[PDB]
Design a binder for this molecule. Structure first.
Ligand SMILES: [Mg+2]
Lengths: 154, 161, 163, 141, 160, 126, 575, 142, 51, 165
RNA sequence: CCAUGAUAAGGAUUAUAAAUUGAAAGUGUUAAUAUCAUAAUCAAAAUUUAUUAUUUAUAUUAAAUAUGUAUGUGUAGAUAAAAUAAGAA
């Protein structure tokens, strides 16, 4: 991995809200799919996401269907239900991706960005060459040179 | 020349103060903040740091996977398969009247930091271990997937009669 | 200027300004009319004379037309003079190709690096000497290998001057 | 647009105070400069940590094999001569040619400020422990 | 038609490491060359900076130089050949003409009569076929002649 | 601004080409861009292999025109060509809103805004 | 060429208004006008041409002008009889009628319902559009001392415009009268509208082989060194070079001794000098301008005045200045200019050994001017050398002592009989005595203060590579050379395996240009563009730091201040 | 301008904090002219070539009655130290003087040896308000 | 040598250590001796200049 | 790589021909050209931007040369440089001036020819007319100021100012 | 230095078609009140002013002279901008 620096983490829903721009940017979705496929594992969640979002983009210039006055608030409650369902499928995806990427990096002898977890290797977030001399969230001092996660030979 | 024993007017002037705090206007304290990860919950630290998968990484992945196939190693494949089986189970439909809380209006001005703060903390509160709308456990039946290593093609010689 | 700067004190220096801004004179001739029988019977500009001409004046030629722009002096008279001078001068030199072959400008060929088929013989160069040698080197290696663990090419056929 | 209010008078004995302050500010600046030039040349001559990043390849590989071999037997004298400053190290690796194209593209080197630490550096805190009274532009030990 | 980056992204509110966003002078841009433009850290505007490093015009110029370098480099790794100056008489027939200099006339076709329509400028010749011309001194040929493949010969591809 | 030259290939090998380069390389293998250029051959219920198109850039030239907006333009171009060639094909195209031109522009540059386009400068209460 | 495409003289009138329709309507007016004036003139030339065609005499002068060639295409002096010449004249006049009719006919097409003046077929003259000049002014509409923000938010865009129609008239001949009416149209030009006149005509130029002769390259070459900055102002004269048309006959000479000396036929020499029937020693003669051996003013060999036995003033040694100033026919101050030693020691030239005559007084001899010797190529025969030098093979043989085979020879002696020689050094060069005449005072002060050298560098300077940079120096710095490096075979041979047979891979006898297209000074050590990205990134190439400068573009200051002297169309094309 | 520190305070507007095109600001005030660099010592705020001649101001150009201060771009020469003559430079408040000669000065401009912004702050040139504000900045004690 | 190209080529022989006064403990420079008084040079101006 | 540029004189070849460097020199004589000897061969860079039909900014000419260190102070820059004489700077110099018609003619001349007399500027005229109108009510708010005081301070032999109240 | 005029900034309900998301209510320099004074850049210069988007860790000072300081858990209060070839319901 090339980008090593300390980073700013966004909450999932805001990442998803980027829609066609990042989250659903066709290119990115494709290379994620390529990851899954290469691991010999189906991509169901990704495929749900692309279904949802493909539809989102198709209709993005249209007006929402007429809302008739309800004391009961069923149209509101139901369309909301649908909505948080979709949000939840995409949380599953976003999670999935972050997961598999940390793991696949674990197999590829790869060093993540600063303060990132890699499940079997660095349990506490891994750091080397940070702008700050201590581990950020450990409040423990960093060794020079950068910590090595993998045995030497390549 | 010949550096003096005393400086009359040099060290005489009032010393500039060392800043008390950092960030904006040097007023911000050092403390735990929103951006902090927790390493105690799940395989992925939360909130998750940004991650970039490069095609370069994909080709490395390919060579690793090939080389793994050819050495007869079924292990890491089975780890991965387990992970996928656990976290890909289809999220259940939420019951009417269950929505993610918004930030209540008329608290702060529209331009205020409180908004984001609330979002970040609410999501930080719900970790993927806390998602109860996705059915992960030994309890769950998984109609779409194979259960254990026995049922995958590299075991095929046990499947014959 | 027929308008503003036409009739008063500033008319002079404006007028002059414009004349010095326009002092460029362009001088053209085709290279088809330079190929003609000269008064001695020789062809004035022939093929090689033109090759030498074209390489001589680089970008001053296009579409088979020689075009010299003389800006050097403040006035158009002197630029026709200067231009004609540079033209007759350039022709003077370019005509040298009628003096014999030693002035015909070389053709610039792009000649490929030696091809693959020829690059293969690069491994067989001095074959025998190299094999018969490789045995003795193997000996020195087999003997060096008894003392130490790793045998460098620098302990065998490679020479690194110490000081 | 307010009419600008007039500036108050200079002050008394201030011309001598200022002459003096600037004067001895310069006489101080002489030892500042001297000390900093000593520090800079001293840095230049003394040894540094290895400029390459052992977390990537062709470097992660065991120190008994690969690149390190190429370094031990062929390049050693040269690398030790320039005291592992990252500019001539990288340049030598360019000129050795047996790595050839990779030095910039595949291989990876420690960021500027880390590669500047003295040989035998243990903890990262060493970046902020260097003397601050000297003007070398982070080029002092 | 290249998909690389020719443009230095405009200065704005400070970009920080995110999904979809990296710092402006981050190492990954322009093959690391942004090292040259980088002022590290929480910069103090009043006392500190190097002015040229925040200036759009200057930065962009440096980047344009860098791009020019890359392209130059790749056009020169593209060459397998040299330019040799060979006297008019000895040279292959299709060069016996007059060949205007670069950007002077229409791009010129080598031999429209013999059915080769291609740039003479970019025509490249084999060092084997010029052997007798280029090395008259050597006597016996220093490069062994090209083996050519018979197009009328029955071989595997002919289904024989 | 693009201009589609369209001809019919009786040999059934068609190809589409932009500024002299194969469409595959120009839109850079991104499928979701190229399908846009395919669309008018679908809406006309035609086979794409019967047609050769070459497209010319008359607008601001750039190293890469691969992006959705430029793709949209390309699609519009090919479609208008196709209508010129097969007149009745204009009815389905029009209904599917291919032939439709949208008028949208980046906001003009302007010194008043910070980024030069949309962002007004900082405001402070006196 | 026929019809529209061709002409003798082309006029382009560029009309410029502040408003578009202004210049458009203006173009229509001026166009109609030139249609009528055009018809008039061209009609008249047509009736003239038709008369000429009907019959007429031929000049003695034109006839003479056809018959001047030493040898015409059939390889002998050709006789054009007046018949033939009239036949040529007639052909061309027929062509002229074709073109006149073309123009006149076009003039009569544009009738009121049918007028279209843009297309060149439909009307003469026609009209091209030219892209309008448009300058956008961008500025603050607020006067505020208080805040930048508010100034910015107040910004107006306004423009200055200038509009251009262009009027094209191509004419089959050149009439002064047409030019007159046309330059005159500026006086009745429309309100607030101005114009330009682009004239492109055809004009005979004349190339002399007399003043700009075609000669062999000098037997000394000119290096890159003759070209430094200010080499244009110092080391070169402005062409053409001055060749003497006047020559003094030496003693033992006869007509063809002088003719063989000057490199011309005897006939020629007799005709330029036609006045004289005989040439005695010490007489001045006219060199026929077609002579090959003509001398340049002030040959490079300095005239030297030895002290010796002098006048009767001593008969021993020359003493005072003006004595020699009388001997060499110059002012004393010139003589003082040339000799810096003889000026500073004393005026009585006490102890001084010689004097150097001012550049003005030097005389050239065919001996100092033309190289006595010639270089022999690999393939050379005496036949080829003879052809090259225009000599008969036998005269070459004589001076070269009957040698037959030229192979063992680097140099062959040239016969004084030869026609085409090699000059010893380039003629157009500026003799050094001139540039030294400029600098005289300094060259004296060099001797006075005894200056052997002025070091431009500190003592140890090349120990520090990046510190001393003259502002002629350039990045990337070129590395010092290495012996075996140029290719793998050589490298292998000298370093790796030393019993290797082939010391260098095959080297084509002809020149190989490794930097191309770039030309470079031969014998200089140089670098080739870098293929490996690392070689670029890790080199010492700097980045732009200060404000950037363009030599032309600096005058119109910034991109934001775009200075323009005149509002010419940005498209505007210099004729 | 708010306070008139000179003539021009009457003529000029500040126009907020306003950006100028790169390296052109109307009034050149080099605050950075003395800015200590050990490694860059010869290349920083000095002659772009070591091979250049000293400026106009290192030489007496004409017949002078004499001068008060020499210009700040005049480079310090060994004679500036040795000769023991008045070397004056126009700085603020009044004039700076090279009094205590040293060889560490030689070959730099007195543009470089004279601190443009002093840390010594007179309170007699300040308004009470101004003094308050400087106290805010932790410059003046109070 | 400036940091850019040759920096590692600097030597301690460029240091005028006899010019200053050093702290033995810190290895740092405390004071500077006077430059001008004792200064002896055969060459105020370059050798080739005679006024 | 790094090589020594080289030149084969036409006498040495097994066929004579004109070497391209020679021609280069012929050209450099004809149109006088400074040969830059220190010109690195490794620095040939077409300017990508303006020379490639690919960028919207394409002029077909090398707009700028790309040398980062290029500056106006360099001698070579001065050799190819345009001089401010007879460029726009001049036109500004002469035609932009406070009262525009003082570019067209001398003011005194114009006035003397058109009107019989020289006329004040309008501003002066305002000053004056007001002097008249307000001297005709109040007095002695005034002051008597002039170029030269010697005319009021010793007045001539006549000159008895009329007393006023 | 008293000595009138005049143009800025400032989003809150005339909408989608063949169509603009910037306004009059006045922001230094401008035309009738006069009765202390020469204050104006042509270089190289002195921070107190509400009204300003800077480059945050692989490679880092060459041409007009060009910024030495603030690493500290993206962290107080309080603030800024946007629904316009983009993607918000
Ligand atoms: Mg007002």
């Amino acid at each position: 991995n090339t980008f090593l620096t300390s980073s700013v983490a966004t909450p999932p829903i805001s990442v998803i809200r980027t829609g066609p721009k990042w989250w659903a940017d066709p290119e990115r979705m494709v290379r994620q799919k390529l990851m899954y496929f290469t691991l010999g594992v189906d991509q169901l969640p990704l495929r749900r996401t692309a279904v949802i979002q493909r539809d989102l983009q198709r209709f993005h210039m249209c007006k929402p269907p007429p809302r008739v006055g309800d004391s009961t608030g069923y149209k509101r409650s139901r369309a909301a239900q649908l909505n948080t369902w979709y949000r939840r499928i995409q949380y599953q995806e976003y999670h999935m991706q972050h997961l598999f990427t940390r793991h696949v990096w674990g197999l590829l002898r790869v060093y993540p960005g600063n303060t990132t977890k890699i499940q079997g290797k660095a349990d506490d977030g891994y750091v080397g060459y940070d702008s700050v001399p201590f581990h950020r969230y450990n409040r423990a001092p960093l060794p020079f040179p950068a910590r090595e996660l993998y045995e030497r030979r390549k | 020349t010949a550096t003096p024993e005393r400086f009359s007017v040099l060290g005489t002037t009032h010393p500039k103060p060392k800043r008390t705090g950092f960030g904006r206007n040097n007023k911000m304290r050092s403390k735990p903040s929103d951006n902090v990860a927790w390493y105690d919950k799940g395989p992925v630290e939360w909130l998750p740091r940004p991650v970039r998968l490069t095609y370069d990484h994909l080709d490395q992945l390919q060579q690793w996977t090939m080389r793994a196939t050819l050495d007869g190693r079924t292990e890491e494949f089975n780890r991965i398969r387990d992970l996928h089986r656990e976290w890909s189970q289809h999220p259940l439909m939420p019951v009417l009247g269950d929505v993610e809380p918004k930030f209540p209006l008329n608290l702060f001005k529209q331009n205020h930091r409180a908004k984001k703060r609330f979002l970040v903390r609410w999501h930080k509160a719900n970790t993927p271990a806390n998602w109860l709308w996705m059915p992960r456990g030994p309890t769950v039946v998984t109609p779409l997937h194979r259960t254990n290593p026995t049922q995958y093609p590299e075991n095929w010689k046990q499947m014959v009669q | 200027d027929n308008l503003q700067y036409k009739r008063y004190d500033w008319q002079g220096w404006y007028q002059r300004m414009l004349d010095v801004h326009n002092r460029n004179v362009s001088l053209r001739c085709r290279i088809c009319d330079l190929q003609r029988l000269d008064g001695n019977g020789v062809q004035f500009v022939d093929m090689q004379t033109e090759r030498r001409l074209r390489i001589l004046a680089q970008h001053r030629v296009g579409m088979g037309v020689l075009k010299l722009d003389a800006d050097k002096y403040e006035d158009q008279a002197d630029n026709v003079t200067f231009g004609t001078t540079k033209l007759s001068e350039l022709l003077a030199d370019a005509r040298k190709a009628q003096l014999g072959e030693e002035y015909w400008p070389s053709v610039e060929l792009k000649v490929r690096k030696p091809s693959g088929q020829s690059k293969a013989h690069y491994s067989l160069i001095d074959n025998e000497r190299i094999e018969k040698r490789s045995r003795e080197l193997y000996e020195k290696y087999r003997d060096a290998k008894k003392r130490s663990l790793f045998v460098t090419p620098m302990e065998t056929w490679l020479e690194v001057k110490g000081m | 647009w307010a009419k600008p209010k007039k500036r108050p008078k200079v002050g008394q004995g201030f011309h001598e105070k200022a002459q003096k302050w600037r004067e001895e500010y310069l006489l101080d600046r002489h030892r500042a400069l001297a000390d900093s030039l000593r520090a800079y040349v001293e840095f230049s001559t003394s040894k540094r940590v290895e400029p390459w990043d052992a977390r990537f390849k062709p470097f992660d590989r065991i120190e008994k094999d690969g690149v390190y071999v190429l370094m031990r037997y062929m390049m050693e004298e040269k690398l030790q001569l320039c005291n592992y400053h990252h500019r001539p190290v990288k340049r030598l690796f360019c000129n050795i040619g047996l790595m050839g194209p990779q030095i910039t593209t595949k291989a990876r080197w420690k960021p500027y400020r880390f590669a500047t630490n003295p040989a035998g550096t243990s903890k990262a805190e060493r970046m902020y422990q260097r003397d601050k009274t000297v003007y070398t532009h982070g080029h002092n030990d | 038609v290249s998909t690389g980056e020719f443009d230095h992204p405009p200065f704005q509110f400070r970009q920080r490491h995110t999904f979809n966003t990296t710092p402006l002078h981050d190492a990954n841009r322009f093959g690391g060359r942004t090292a040259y433009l980088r002022e590290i850290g929480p910069v103090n505007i009043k006392k500190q900076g190097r002015r040229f490093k925040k200036d759009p015009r200057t930065v962009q110029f440096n980047v344009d130089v860098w791009c020019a370098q890359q392209t130059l480099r790749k056009r020169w790794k593209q060459r397998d050949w040299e330019v040799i100056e060979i006297p008019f008489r000895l040279v292959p027939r299709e060069q016996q003409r007059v060949i205007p200099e670069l950007y002077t006339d229409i791009p010129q076709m080598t031999d429209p009569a013999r059915n080769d329509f291609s740039n003479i400028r970019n025509k490249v010749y084999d060092r084997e076929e010029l052997q007798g011309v280029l090395f008259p001194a050597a006597g016996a040929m220093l490069y062994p002649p090209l083996q050519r493949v018979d197009k009328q010969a029955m071989t595997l591809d002919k289904y024989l | 601004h693009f201009t589609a030259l369209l001809r019919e290939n009786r040999d059934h090998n068609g190809i589409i080409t932009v500024m002299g380069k194969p469409l595959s390389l120009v839109l850079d293998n991104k499928a979701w861009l190229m399908e846009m250029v395919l669309m008018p051959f679908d809406e006309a219920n035609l086979d794409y292999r019967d047609f050769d198109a070459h497209i010319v850039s008359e607008g601001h030239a750039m190293p890469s025109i691969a992006n959705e907006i430029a793709a949209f333009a390309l699609r519009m171009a090919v479609a208008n060509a196709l209508v010129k060639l097969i007149p009745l094909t204009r009815i389905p195209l029009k209904k599917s809103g291919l032939l439709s031109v949208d008028r949208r522009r980046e906001r003009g540059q302007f010194p008043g805004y910070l980024d030069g386009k949309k962002v007004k400068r900082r405001f402070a209460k006196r | 060429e026929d019809g529209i495409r061709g002409s003798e003289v082309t006029y382009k009138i560029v009309l410029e208004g502040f408003w578009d329709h202004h210049v458009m309507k203006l173009a229509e007016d001026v166009c109609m006008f030139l249609k009528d004036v055009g018809r008039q003139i061209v009609e008249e030339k047509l009736v003239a041409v038709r008369r000429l065609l009907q019959g007429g005499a031929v000049d003695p002068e034109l006839l003479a002008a056809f018959n001047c060639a030493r040898a015409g295409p059939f390889g002998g002096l050709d006789e054009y009889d007046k018949e033939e010449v009239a036949n040529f004249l007639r052909s061309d006049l027929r062509r002229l009628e074709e073109q006149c009719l073309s123009v006149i006919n076009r003039c009569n097409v544009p009738v009121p319902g049918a007028t279209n003046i843009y297309d060149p077929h439909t009307s003469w003259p026609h009209v091209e559009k030219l892209e309008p000049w448009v300058r956008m002014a961008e500025f603050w509409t607020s006067s505020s001392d208080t805040s930048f923000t508010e100034l910015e938010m107040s910004t107006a865009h306004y423009e200055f415009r200038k509009f251009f129609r262009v009027i094209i008239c191509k004419l089959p001949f050149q009439s002064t009268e047409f030019e007159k009416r046309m330059y005159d149209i500026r006086h009745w030009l429309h309100r607030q509208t101005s114009c330009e006149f682009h004239t492109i005509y055809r004009r005979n130029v004349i190339h002399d082989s007399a003043v700009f002769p075609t000669e062999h390259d000098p037997a000394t070459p000119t290096t890159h060194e003759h070209h430094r900055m200010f080499s244009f102002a110092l080391d070169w004269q402005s062409a053409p070079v001055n060749r003497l048309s006047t020559d003094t006959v030496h003693e033992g000479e006869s007509w063809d001794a002088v003719a063989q000396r000057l490199g011309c036929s005897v006939g020629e020499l007799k005709d330029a000098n036609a006045e004289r029937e005989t040439i005695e020693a010490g007489v001045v003669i006219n060199v026929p301008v077609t002579a090959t051996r003509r001398l340049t003013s002030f040959g490079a060999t300095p005239l030297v005045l030895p002290l010796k036995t002098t006048s009767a003033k001593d008969g021993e040694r020359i003493r005072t200045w003006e004595e020699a100033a009388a001997i060499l026919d110059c002012t004393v101050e010139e003589l003082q200019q040339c000799n810096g030693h003889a000026a500073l020691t004393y005026q009585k030239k006490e102890s001084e050994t010689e004097l150097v005559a001012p550049l003005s007084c030097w005389t050239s001899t065919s001996e100092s001017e033309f190289s006595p010797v010639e270089r022999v190529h690999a393939n050379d025969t005496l036949v080829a050398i003879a052809r090259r030098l225009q000599c008969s093979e036998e005269a070459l043989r004589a001076v070269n002592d009957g040698i037959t085979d030229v192979s063992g020879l680097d140099f062959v002696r040239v016969p004084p009989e030869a026609r085409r020689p090699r000059r010893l050094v380039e003629p157009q060069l500026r003799p050094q005595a001139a540039t030294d005449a400029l600098l005289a005072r300094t060259i004296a002060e060099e001797e006075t203060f005894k200056l052997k050298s002025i070091p431009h560098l500190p003592q140890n300077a090349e120990r520090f590579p990046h510190e001393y940079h003259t502002p002629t120096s350039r990045f990337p710095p070129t590395p010092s050379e290495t012996p075996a490096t140029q290719d793998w075979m050589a490298y292998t041979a000298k370093y790796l395996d030393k019993q290797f047979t082939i010391s260098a891979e095959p080297a084509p006898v002809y020149n190989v240009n490794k930097l191309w297209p770039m030309q470079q000074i031969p014998g200089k050590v140089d670098q080739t563009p870098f293929e490996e990205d690392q070689t670029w990134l890790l080199h010492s190439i700097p980045v732009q730091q200060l404000e950037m400068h363009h030599h032309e573009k600096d005058l119109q200051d910034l991109p934001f201040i775009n200075h323009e002297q005149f509002p010419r169309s940005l498209e505007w094309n210099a004729p | 301008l708010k306070i008139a520190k000179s003539a021009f305070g009457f003529y000029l507007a500040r126009r907020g904090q306003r950006k100028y095109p790169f390296l052109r600001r109307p009034h050149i005030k080099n605050t950075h002219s003395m800015n200590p660099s050990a490694p860059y010592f010869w290349s920083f705020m000095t002659a772009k070539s070591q091979m250049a001649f000293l400026p106009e101001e290192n030489y007496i150009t004409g017949d002078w009655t004499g001068k008060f201060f020499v210009s700040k771009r005049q480079v310090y020469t060994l004679q500036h130290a040795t000769s023991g003559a008045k070397v004056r430079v126009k700085s603020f408040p009044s004039i700076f003087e090279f009094n205590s000669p040293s060889r560490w000065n030689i070959g730099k401009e007195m543009n470089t040896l004279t601190k443009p912004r002093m840390d010594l702050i007179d309170e007699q040139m300040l308004t009470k308000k101004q003094r308050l504000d400087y106290v805010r900045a932790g410059l003046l004690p109070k | 040598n400036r940091p850019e190209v040759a920096m590692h080529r600097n030597t301690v022989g460029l240091l005028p250590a006899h010019m200053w006064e050093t702290d033995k403990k810190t290895g740092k420079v405390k004071s500077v001796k006077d430059s001008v008084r004792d200064y002896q040079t055969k060459t105020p101006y370059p050798k080739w200049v005679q006024l | 790589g790094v090589h020594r540029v080289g030149y084969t004189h036409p006498s040495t070849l097994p066929v004579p021909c004109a070497q391209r460097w020679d021609l280069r020199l012929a050209r450099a004589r004809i149109f006088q050209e400074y040969i830059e000897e220190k010109a690195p061969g490794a620095w040939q860079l077409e300017d990508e931007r303006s020379m490639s039909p690919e960028f919207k900014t394409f002029t077909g000419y090398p707009m700028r040369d790309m040398r980062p260190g290029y500056g106006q102070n360099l001698p070579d820059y001065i050799m190819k440089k345009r001089l401010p004489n007879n460029t726009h700077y001049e036109l500004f110099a002469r035609r932009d001036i406070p009262n525009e018609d003082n570019a067209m003619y001398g003011k005194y001349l114009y006035d003397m020819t058109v009107h019989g007399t020289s006329l004040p500027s309008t501003y002066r005229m305002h000053k004056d007319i007001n002097k008249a109108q307000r001297n005709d009510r109040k007095l002695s708010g005034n002051r008597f100021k002039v170029l030269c005081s010697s005319g009021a301070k010793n007045p001539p032999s006549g000159w008895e100012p009329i007393p006023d109240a």
